[PDB]
Amino acid sequence: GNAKIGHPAPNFKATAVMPDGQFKDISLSDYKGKYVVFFFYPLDFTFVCPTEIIAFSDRAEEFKKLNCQVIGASVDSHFSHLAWVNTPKKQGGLGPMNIPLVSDPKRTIAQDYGVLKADEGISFRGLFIIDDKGILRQITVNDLPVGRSVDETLRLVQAFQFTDKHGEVCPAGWKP
Amino acid sequence: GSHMSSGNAKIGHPAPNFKATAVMPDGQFKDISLSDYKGKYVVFFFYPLDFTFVCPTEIIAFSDRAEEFKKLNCQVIGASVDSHFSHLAWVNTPKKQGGLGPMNIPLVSDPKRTIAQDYGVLKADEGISFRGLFIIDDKGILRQITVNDLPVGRSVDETLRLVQAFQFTDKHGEVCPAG
Ligand SMILES: C[C@H](CCC(=O)NCCC[N+](C)(C)CCCS(=O)(=O)[O-])[C@H]1CC[C@H]2[C@@H]3[C@H](O)C[C@@H]4C[C@H](O)CC[C@]4(C)[C@H]3C[C@H](O)[C@]12C
Secondary structure: OOOOOOOEOOOOEEEEEOOOOOEEEEEHHHHOOOEEEEEEOOEOOOEOOHHHHHHHHHOHHHHHHOOEEEEEEEOOOHHHHHHHHOOOHHHOOOOOOOOOEEEOOOOHHHHHOOOEEOOOOEEOEEEEEEOOOOEEEEEEEEOOOOOOOHHHHHHHHHHHHHHHHHOOOOOOOOOO | OOOOOOOOOOOOOEOOOOEEEEEOOOOOEEEEEHHHHOOOEEEEEEEOOOHHHOOHHHHHHHHHOHHHHHHOOEEEEEEEOOOHHHHHHHHOOOHHHOOOOOOOOOEEEOOOOHHHHHOOOOOOOOOOOOEEEEEEOOOOEEEEEEEEOOOOOOOHHHHHHHHHHHHHHHHOOOOOOOO
């Protein structure tokens, strides 16, 4: 991997499926001036709970209020992302999305983000917080097969922005 | 190496073992290994800068509630690039004077930065707050890496729920009611 805290998030250009249903080649740099929640999940339909994408799609406006763009990703092609989008969510599909879904079928974005199982060719679950300047602020990687909490993720973005503005909430030990 | 941009720590693999001198809760030094906790979950905090750069209340809050992790068959361990005597000095300084006071958890020393290297958390460019949390399960397998430079104290409650989620899912599988 190249992803590293305090450095620019590795930039990719990739095909995404956009909220309007269309394919568009996008880059993380497109969102400079906004915080970004970028999350990797293993595989459409078979190795992820639909609701961990749905809960972020549903609540995307809570994120846009914080000036934050949410983007999902997996090693799936854009064709497979679109198929899951066009599967109804009462059929355990995604249904229509308020957020873009990046495709990584060559596995090079997952490798670059340091979340690839090279043998299996699927990512772990990864959460990346990237600030309005494009700088990587958090990495979480795990193999925990439950959905990420939207509330917690909002709170985290809020904590980063707060401390961006105000400095340390929990002061360093040397400080008077 | 790792899938990680640095270190040898890899999700789904044995956590890198280390043998290092620890200051134990009562203040004795003991040379310990991560393998000493096989059979238990471990919550491993690593501070890649010495404790003067760290918010003592973060570590204190975890030490204070260590019994709650012990109930979950989980050992909390804190580690930093401090020497073992530095750690002893910190715990032997009362909180009221800005120290740590007595801890309910071991503090592991990494003055040679070999644990830091192995765990992918050598200090570099980042905010001064850069530090890591690692979740190791009772088989010794690394289950989570979180790293960030957020100068806010980590939540004990969230961490407890995290450990319980790992443990729940270890025994009952994936969680997806609507899947
Ligand atoms: C400079 C700071 C003090 C800064 C400070 O003023 N911290 C604010 C806390 C005040 N609060 C009211 C918020 C405390 C909360 C009250 S409560 O009791 O509720 O926790 C003090 C606090 C503890 C200190 C170190 C330790 O001794 C260990 C060691 C002893 C050696 O010989 C000399 C080196 C070393 C590293 C010491 C250096 C330094 O000297 C430290 C960082």
